[PDB]
Amino acid sequence: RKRISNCVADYSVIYNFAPFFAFKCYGVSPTKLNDLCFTNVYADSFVIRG
Amino acid sequence: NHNAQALNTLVKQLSSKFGAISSVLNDILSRLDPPEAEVQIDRLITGRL
Numbered sequence A: 001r002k003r004i005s006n007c008v009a010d011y012s013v014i015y016n017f018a019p020f021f022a023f024k025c026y027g028v029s030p031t032k033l034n035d036l037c038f039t040n041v042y043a044d045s046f047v048i049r050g
Numbered sequence B: 001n002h003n004a005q006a007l008n009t010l011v012k013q014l015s016s017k018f019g020a021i022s023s024v025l026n027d028i029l030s031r032l033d034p035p036e037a038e039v040q041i042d043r044l045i046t047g048r049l
Helices: A012-017 A030-035 B002-015 B025-031 B038-048
Strands: A002-004 A041-043
Touching: A030 B025, B002 B038, B025 B038
Parallel strands: none
Antiparallel strands: A002 A041
16 A cells, blocks of 8 residues: 655556556546646556456 | 525526536536436426426
């Protein structure tokens, strides 16, 4: 678990990273993350079967 | 007194959610896609009507 705060967030690197297999957002629209402001950001990573 | 009570209640009713994500239209518009906005907007419309 990683906590992200007190920084400027850019999400172009997300598309630059890899040709994603899946990209699903629930509370927000993926094309409008560029215009929102958030209190805290939590980053969680692990490995799962395909 | 009755007129003031009625007007105050009517203006107070604008802060209800009616089972939606938020009670402000601008927040809904600026956080979502039009295809996913009608579902939220309908509840507010019905409550205010």
